[PDB]
Nucleic acid binder design. Structure first.
Ligand SMILES: Nc1nc2c(ncn2[C@H]2C[C@H](O)[C@@H](COP(=O)(O)OP(=O)(O)OP(=O)(O)O)O2)c(=O)[nH]1
Ligand SMILES: Nc1nc2c(ncn2[C@H]2C[C@H](O)[C@@H](COP(=O)(O)OP(=O)(O)OP(=O)(O)O)O2)c(=O)[nH]1
Ligand SMILES: Nc1ncnc2c1ncn2[C@@H]1O[C@H](COP(=O)(O)OP(=O)(O)OP(=O)(O)O)[C@@H](O)[C@H]1O
Ligand SMILES: Nc1ncnc2c1ncn2[C@@H]1O[C@H](COP(=O)(O)OP(=O)(O)OP(=O)(O)O)[C@@H](O)[C@H]1O
Ligand SMILES: [Mg+2]
Ligand SMILES: [Mg+2]
Ligand SMILES: [Zn+2]
Ligand SMILES: [Zn+2]
Lengths: 343, 355
DNA sequence: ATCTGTACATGTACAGAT
DNA sequence: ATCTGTACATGTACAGAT
DNA sequence: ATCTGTACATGTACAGAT
DNA sequence: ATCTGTACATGTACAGAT
């Protein structure tokens, strides 16, 4: 049943091969252009992120997320009044004393659009800009559509901002050494605007990737000399439930896969033992993820996993009516054996 | 008994007062020696410090009176030639190391002799501290310092070559931690450098002064401090295990016996450290080292060790074909002697623990 | 004036002390 | 139970060099 | 600075076994 | 029906060379 759905969602080896080689041609050419032409982003480096590099992309390898990260030393940070995730940056990049996210992104966008016009072997265009968003999105066609988000990022090597001090609550699950080591990694700021044009937002995509590929309380979880768990499969199932619902209902435009990812990070913290995610218990595990997600809807509270005071389900971000609509749609699917999984 | 062994561990536990006093002096001497290696003409310029052994693994027992530190030198143009299929011993082939070269071959005893000479000269300029250099012992790398920081303290300075290439093929089937610490940990550990230290034997055999031996002290240190199958083992939000406690008790059994019986000169603490690495591989679950089962965990370690003695087989954990209990290293008479002494302690309530 | 090897500054796991 | 000294990893300042 | 070579993690695919 | 072993594929870390 759920097993059969996961067979449908599993990517095909041939499809993976053909998408990646086209994606990698385009990204390599873009990363070269940021370097060789003496742009203000010389030194930018590639960091692959998101579901495809975390091995939880479902259905088709048709959406790829790539970070172009740039070290900036002396990056004075001021919290955009009390939001937790949004900051103003202060002190080559002289043409952007506040580093305007909008101004930096636009020049980054301009460069990419120029380089895309010279690619003659791949059918690739730049998607119209979505306001406030941090991405430059590419639309590729090998006959099948593939989109690529190029995400500009500032990389800072100082200790993480104080609003994360209580985040990453992995101590009872991945442990204190893993937590201390992860917080010795840099933190990242991404030109996503708040509601304004100068604000950046923290990104922990690199930390989330590590967690996805090192998710057990036992070191051997899902390795060739350990036992499989069903953590990622539950994430896939929940991503699919939301993807299918978002296709149908325009009322759900405010929801995104990151809400499902955040909710399962909390569930993985609540239920740390690998035996609590036995493959034989896939249905129970999926159902308790559903119940926890519904509890977040009812209480209007889904805290950012790295930034606990930042409520992704606040009234300001998602209207109460949207959350009650999603609650009804999920409650219905749950009570009837998920008919939407058969479409 | 659960409570007998707990009281022994209390006797074994180091005191913070002693730790602080010993380490103040040790760090002063070591730093001064590391700095001297970095100046002017020194062939050892660039050498880096790596703290190793039981004190930095937190399994030193009774007193903080013996510290091990590696002075490691990266060497790039490195070709290795195995010494008679022994797995552990190598010739090194290829520059400040020119005066140690014997046409292509890097001489261990020539390099160690200069290293030792520089150290002895620097120790003579120390006025702060009562510290001298111990008479060289055959079979040992190590320049050993005897510090009389009132109480006696030994510091083994080990000269090491550092190579960043892939580990020598004699290790391909060693480090069998896949069912315990896992494949990602194993791959990450084998991406670290490997180390070569002087063999420095006086056997009179061919290549005597040009043979080196592999050292995995850094890997052992990581394993000691990341020893559980669960990542939270012995952490502040995890459960305590008794793995290190079993190591201390077995170390203590051997030290007490070795103090009394010169018949045991061939045995050393590395033998019990190797044995418990195998035991940790055999019983990988943290629940097989519950602190409530300290007695039986200690007993099963004794029994595994006794079987190694009687069958004359204790494979090096990193180099499986190298047998640390071969007849060529330890006489059958020495093994039967230790076996009876261990059997005796085991069956009469460990009276040697009360001495 | 700028560059850089050396060592201070900061943070916290481990484990003894109280 | 909390308090605390050592070891250690990484970031960053600057005297002396260039 | 840039780039290839190597090793093995993470995956999918499928036949034979269970 | 699931498990197991081999073959096939991409992603990622990092040594060494240029
Ligand atoms: N790697 C990475 N990609 C990000 C990050 N934030 C956003 N992205 C990428 C993938 C997202 O689907 C895409 C759009 O970002 P958002 O959905 O947060 O903002 P947008 O302005 O599109 O509107 P929305 O808030 O969803 O209504 O940009 C981040 O922190 N890291
Ligand atoms: N880092 C490191 N130090 C080592 C190694 N082998 C020996 N040492 C050092 C630290 C020890 O306290 C000291 C012991 O010297 P040896 O192991 O050469 O002793 P030997 O075999 O002569 O006699 P033994 O078996 O101990 O009775 O030398 C090694 O592989 N790595
Ligand atoms: N609202 C957000 N807040 C913070 N980080 C986000 C947000 N949306 C996305 N991200 C980060 O960017 C990554 C890529 O975003 P994207 O929307 O492509 O999701 P994903 O994880 O790749 O999953 P999928 O593409 O399969 O829906 C996320 O995995 C996450 O690290
Ligand atoms: N025979 C050996 N073969 C390989 N490595 C060895 C050998 N003897 C010692 N070593 C390495 O050198 C380190 C220091 O040796 P040493 O004899 O001081 O033991 P130790 O583990 O520090 O314990 P203790 O000093 O308390 O007896 C060991 O921990 C080990 O990594
Ligand atoms: Mg994505
Ligand atoms: Mg020692
Ligand atoms: Zn798993
Ligand atoms: Zn433990």
């Amino acid at each position: 049943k759920l097993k059969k759905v996961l067979d449908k969602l599993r990517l095909k080896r041939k499809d993976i091969s053909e998408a990646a080689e086209t994606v990698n041609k385009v990204v390599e050419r873009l990363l070269r252009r940021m370097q060789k032409r003496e742009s203000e982003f010389k030194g930018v480096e590639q960091l692959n992120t998101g579901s495809y590099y975390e091995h939880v992309k479902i259905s088709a390898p048709n959406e790829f997320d790539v970070m172009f990260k740039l070290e900036v030393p002396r990056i004075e940070l001021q919290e955009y009044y009390e939001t937790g995730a949004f900051y103003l940056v202060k002190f080559p990049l002289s043409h952007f004393e506040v580093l305007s996210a909008t101004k930096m992104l636009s020049k980054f966008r301009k460069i990419i659009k120029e380089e895309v016009k010279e690619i003659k072997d791949i059918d690739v265009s730049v998607e119209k800009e979505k306001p406030g968003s941090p991405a430059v999105t590419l639309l590729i066609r090998n006959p099948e559509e593939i989109s690529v988000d190029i995400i500009l990022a500032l990389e800072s090597k100082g200790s993480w901002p104080i609003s994360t001090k209580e985040g990453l609550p992995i101590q009872g699950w991945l442990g204190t050494k893993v937590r201390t080591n992860l917080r010795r990694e840099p933190f990242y700021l991404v030109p996503k605007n708040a509601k304004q044009g100068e604000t950046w937002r923290l990104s922990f995509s690199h930390t989330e990737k590590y967690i996805l590929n090192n998710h057990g309380i036992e070191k051997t979880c899902c390795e060739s000399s350990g036992a499989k768990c069903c953590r990622k499969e539950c994430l896939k199932l929940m991503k699919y439930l939301l993807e299918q619902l978002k296709k149908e209902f325009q009322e759900l435009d405010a929801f995104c896969s990151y809400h499902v990812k955040t909710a399962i990070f909390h569930m993985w913290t609540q239920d740390p033992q690998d035996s609590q995610w036995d493959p034989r218990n896939l249905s129970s595990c999926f159902d308790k993820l559903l119940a926890f997600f519904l509890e977040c809807l009812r209480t209007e509270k889904l805290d950012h996993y790295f930034i606990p005071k930042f409520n992704l389900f606040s009234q300001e971000l998602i209207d109460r009516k949207s959350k009650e609509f999603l609650s009804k749609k999920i409650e219905y699917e749950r009570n009837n054996g998920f008919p939407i999984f058969d479409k």
